[PDB]
């Protein structure tokens, strides 16, 4: 929703050195329903022109829109597939970690995301497919900001504060 989102997501995810970030925004037609707003992909794949490395994120979004009708799906790493399949998710009120972050107003820091119970995290199998161990959601700018990484990161609210400062620049 907010201005310069794609770039702010890029700056923040690159600074904290995590695998990706997503901004989940509230549907303009369905109150309380979250959908994929924007994202930055910072993970593995198999410059003065693109200092923020935005290209792969753009190509992954392009591919998603193609498939949902430059990159071919056979080219994608496990983590890229995770990032792309996230674009298909929509969360009802209180559903999943994004819906729960919106509804309860507090960060949710999920460790062992690959094996999280379905009542807590609706993407555990998908995370397991990409060895995505840590997912954090927090309410932000009227939506929910999600960051994820393949590393196990012990809970550290300074990571969330770092992201927030890079947005409220």
């Amino acid at each position: 929703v907010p201005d310069n989102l794609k770039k702010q997501l890029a700056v923040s995810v690159r600074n904290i050195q995590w695998s990706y970030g997503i901004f989940w925004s509230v549907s303009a037609s369905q109150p309380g329903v979250l959908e994929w707003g924007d994202g930055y992909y910072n993970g593995d794949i198999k410059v003065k022109i693109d200092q923020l490395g935005l290209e792969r994120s753009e190509q992954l979004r392009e591919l998603y829109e193609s498939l949902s009708l430059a990159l071919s799906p056979e080219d994608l790493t496990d983590t890229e597939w995770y990032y792309l399949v996230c674009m298909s998710f929509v969360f009802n009120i209180g559903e999943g970690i994004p819906g729960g972050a919106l509804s309860n107003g507090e960060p949710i820091w999920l460790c062992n995301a690959e094996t999280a119970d379905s009542k807590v995290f609706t993407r555990s199998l998908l995370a397991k497919s990409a060895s995505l161990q840590t997912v954090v959601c927090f309410p932000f700018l009227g939506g929910v900001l999600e960051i994820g990484t393949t590393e196990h990161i012990k809970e550290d609210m300074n990571v969330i504060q770092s992201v927030k400062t890079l947005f409220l620049e």
């Binding site: 498939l67 056979e74 399949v85 379905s118 609706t122 199998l125 998908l126």
Partner: protein
């Protein structure tokens, strides 16, 4: 092929994206082979 409810949702999700490219669906489903997903799909759709 006794899929859990999460496997079903994710297979449907992958199917809606790549169709019958069972290799690409299976890569998203830990522990399941491309034929298991094909076997599941025919008996459901």
């Amino acid at each position: 092929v006794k899929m859990s409810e999460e496997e079903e949702d994710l297979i449907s999700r992958m199917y809606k994206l790549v169709g019958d490219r069972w290799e690409l669906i299976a890569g998203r489903i830990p522990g399941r082979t491309p034929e298991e997903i094909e076997r599941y799909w025919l008996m459901k759709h």
